[PDB]
């Protein structure tokens, strides 16, 4: 390696000495993939009768010099194409004085006619060949992939495919959404008062205003302000920020999508979610059957629906449901399971925590859990029959929470009361409790039509579609400890 670096650096020095070492005038007219799709099925005789002269450019990955002729493999955006480099085809001295002196990793440009070798390999009989960029380091533990993605992308075909599929999926979500009358929007990333979820925010200071501002933990309250203003079908895909452990299954910043449609309840959201996945699986993967890890989910089949209580009873059948109707009982129950009950918690929270311990990890196949207690749903419409629970649902796949949506609370007086409770909880030590957003209440006071909103964790979604098992395998540049 140390010898490799010196060698390459000496070679660069020679280049500088004779002119331009870093030229930018070479132009290519094809990527390997195009050449492949169009010519991989044509007979050598056919290709020979058509002097299809192309020019490509990319990174020299392999080379086999057999005196007077060499076979090189070039890699560009689309993949690899094979070059046939022969002394007598290139200009005088190029093959010996230049080509043979180049290193693997070097970026080169080539021009020549297409043909096929006796194997069925599409190749380019080079007539012009030139060095565009000298690589000073040799072509390339699990941390390196994340700390230097560019290396990962060069080596790993699978790593590339994952990120390409990522872009395909995002493009498909926007198209799905737009086809249904939704309009994409951009709401503030820096907020005076954070909200829309329960999490520890990042804080940054604006100097000009001397104002402390928070990085968005959710765009919810702003999106809903647009529904009051008339944008009745609105959605947004962008980042949220949260102060938590880097976890190796977490990242301080991640991509979320939120959507709100007026004149709709959560039931409409359940259908939309099912259609979204079925469609994405169908379009991007070709199947509604998605093999993830040691599992096969079927997205072309309606998902399971269980109320939170059904889920608890199902995964801990010895549970006396009566215990969940009384604070003291639920508390003691919670503690027996090993749940440390904080002082700010009420019955609904204790019940939810019990749910998280007991049932969450067993929710492998796509499941919707419904009827969340009011206490843990500050922004969700109360159920008409039982106002102690809200018309909210969460959505799980592979034992992890993928989505969260609900019939929105458009009762300003109730919203205000719910925010007050949040403040009291914050005073009592719940530092994830929400802030009282006075302006949001005011917006509701002008009138929010009955609405349903849904949030979906996009990174998590991308994991399922690429069989990636860490959130870090699906984010180009994950957070690390430099």
d(CA 183, CA 128): 50
Q: Does 327 bind a second copy (CB under 8 A)?
A: no
Asked if 470 and 243 touch (Cβ cutoff 8 Å), the reply is: no
CA-based nearest residue to 237, from 167, 163, 165: 167
Q: Show contacts with ligand LYS in window 345-364 (CB under 6 A).
A: none
Out of 7, 14, 23, 427, name the contact with a second copy by CB under 8 A: 23
CA-based nearest residue to 293, from 235, 228, 364: 364
Q: Does 208 bind a second copy (CB under 8 A)?
A: yes
Q: Closer to a second copy at the Cβ: 109 or 112?
A: 109
CA-based nearest residue to 197, from 156, 150, 241: 241
Interface pattern 59-98 for a second copy (x via CB under 8 A): x---------------xxx---------------------
Q: Closer to ligand LYS at the Cβ: 123 or 404?
A: 404
Q: Does 149 bind a second copy (CB under 8 A)?
A: yes
For the CB of residue 264, give the shortest distance to ligand LYS in the complex, in Å. 11
For the CB of residue 320, give the shortest distance to a second copy in the complex, in Å. 34
Q: Is 10 annotated in some ligand binding site?
A: no
Q: Closer to ligand LYS at the Cβ: 106 or 408?
A: 408
Q: Does 101 bind a second copy (CB under 8 A)?
A: no
Out of 196, 201, 366, 373, name the contact with ligand LYS by CB under 6 A: 196
Q: Show contacts with ligand LYS in window 433-462 (CB under 6 A).
A: 453-455
Q: Show contacts with a second copy in window 241-300 (CB under 8 A).
A: 241, 243-246, 252-253, 255, 262-265
Handedness of CA 186, 189, 193, 199 (dihedral sign): positive
Query: Could you say which of a second copy, ligand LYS, none residue 258 binds, taking C-beta under 5 to 8 angstroms by partner kind?
Result: ligand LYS
Residues in the chain: 482
Q: Does 405 bind ligand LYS (CB under 6 A)?
A: yes
Q: Does 374 bind ligand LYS (CB under 6 A)?
A: no
Burial of 161 (0-12, 13-18, 19+ CB in 10 A): exposed
Query: Could you say which of ligand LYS, a second copy, none residue 253 binds, taking C-beta under 5 to 8 angstroms by partner kind?
Result: a second copy
Residues near 256 by Cβ (< 8 Å), separated by ≥ 6?
218, 219, 237, 238, 239, 240, 455, 456, 457, 458
Query: Could you say which of a second copy, ligand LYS, none residue 229 binds, taking C-beta under 5 to 8 angstroms by partner kind?
Result: a second copy
CA-based nearest residue to 464, from 238, 298, 242, 245: 298
d(CA 90, CA 110): 10
* Stretch touching a second copy by CB under 8 A, among 320-328, 359-367, 371-379, 441-449: 441-449
* Residues touching a second copy, count (CB under 8 A): 110
Q: Is 371 annotated in some ligand binding site?
A: no
d(CA 55, CA 34): 12
CA-based nearest residue to 421, from 375, 464, 463, 360: 375
For the CB of residue 242, give the shortest distance to ligand LYS in the complex, in Å. 10
Q: Does 416 bind ligand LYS (CB under 6 A)?
A: no
Only one residue has tokens 């565009």, namely 132
Q: Does 152 bind a second copy (CB under 8 A)?
A: yes
Q: Does 154 bind a second copy (CB under 8 A)?
A: yes
Query: Could you say which of ligand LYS, a second copy, none residue 407 binds, taking C-beta under 5 to 8 angstroms by partner kind?
Result: a second copy
d(CA 185, CA 233): 10
* Stretch touching a second copy by CB under 8 A, among 38-46, 130-138, 279-287, 299-307: 130-138
For the CB of residue 17, give the shortest distance to ligand LYS in the complex, in Å. 28
For the CB of residue 462, give the shortest distance to a second copy in the complex, in Å. 11
For the CB of residue 423, give the shortest distance to ligand LYS in the complex, in Å. 19
Q: Does 197 bind ligand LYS (CB under 6 A)?
A: yes
d(CA 318, CA 421): 33
d(CA 67, CA 63): 12
d(CA 479, CA 482): 9
CA-based nearest residue to 80, from 72, 92, 88: 72
Q: What angle do CA 398, 399, 403 make, to 5 degrees?
A: 85
Binding residues: 394, 401
Binding residues for Mg(2+): 394, 401
């Amino acid at each position: 390696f140390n010898d490799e670096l010196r060698n390459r650096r000496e070679k660069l020095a020679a280049l500088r000495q004779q002119g331009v070492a870093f030229p930018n005038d070479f132009r290519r007219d094809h990527t390997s993939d195009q050449l492949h799709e169009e010519f991989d099925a044509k007979d050598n005789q056919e290709l020979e009768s058509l002097n299809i002269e192309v020019s490509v450019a990319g990174r020299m990955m392999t080379r086999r010099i057999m005196g007077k002729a060499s076979f090189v493999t070039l890699q560009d955006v689309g993949g690899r194409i094979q070059l046939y480099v022969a002394r007598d085809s290139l200009p005088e001295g190029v093959y010996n004085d230049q080509f043979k002196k180049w290193d693997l990793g070097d970026i080169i440009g080539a021009r020549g006619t297409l043909f096929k070798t006796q194997t069925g390999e599409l190749s380019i009989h080079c007539t012009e060949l030139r060095l565009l960029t000298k690589a000073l380091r040799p072509l390339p533990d699990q941390e390196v992939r994340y700390r230097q993605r560019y290396l990962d992308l060069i080596a790993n075909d699978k790593s590339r495919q994952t990120f390409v599929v990522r872009s395909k999926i995002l493009a498909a979500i926007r198209q799905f959404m737009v086809a249904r009358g939704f309009m994409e929007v951009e709401t503030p990333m820096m907020q005076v008062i954070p909200g829309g979820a329960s999490a520890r925010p990042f804080i940054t200071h604006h100097n000009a205003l001397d104002l402390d501002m928070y990085l968005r933990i959710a765009p919810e309250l702003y999106l809903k302000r647009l529904v009051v203003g008339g944008f009745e079908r609105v959605f947004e895909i962008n980042r949220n920020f949260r102060n938590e452990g880097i976890s190796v299954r977490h990242n301080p910043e991640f991509t979320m999508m939120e959507l709100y449609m007026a004149y709709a309840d959560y039931h409409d959201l359940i259908e939309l979610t099912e259609s979204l996945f079925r469609t994405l699986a169908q379009e991007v993967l070709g199947t509604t059957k998605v093999t993830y890890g040691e599992h096969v989910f079927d997205f072309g089949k309606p998902f399971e629906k269980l109320t939170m209580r059904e889920a608890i009873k199902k995964y801990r059948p010895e549970t006396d449901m009566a215990d969940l109707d009384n604070f003291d009982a639920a508390k003691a129950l919670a503690e027996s399971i090993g749940i440390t009950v904080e002082k700010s918690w009420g019955l609904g929270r204790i019940v939810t925590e019990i749910f998280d311990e007991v049932a969450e990890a067993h929710l492998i196949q796509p499941t919707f859990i419904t009827e969340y207690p009011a206490e843990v749903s500050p922004l969700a419409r109360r159920n008409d029959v039982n106002p102690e629970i809200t018309d909210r649902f969460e959505f799980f796949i592979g034992g992890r929470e993928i989505g969260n949506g609900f019939s929105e609370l458009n009762d300003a007086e109730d919203q205000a009361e719910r925010f007050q409770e949040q403040v009291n909880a914050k005073a009592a030590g719940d530092d994830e409790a929400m802030f009282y957003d006075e302006d949001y209440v005011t917006a509701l006071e002008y009138g929010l039509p009955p609405t349903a909103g849904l949030g979906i964790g996009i990174d998590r979604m991308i994991m399922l579609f690429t069989n990636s098992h860490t959130i870090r395998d699906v984010i180009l540049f994950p957070a690390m400890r430099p």
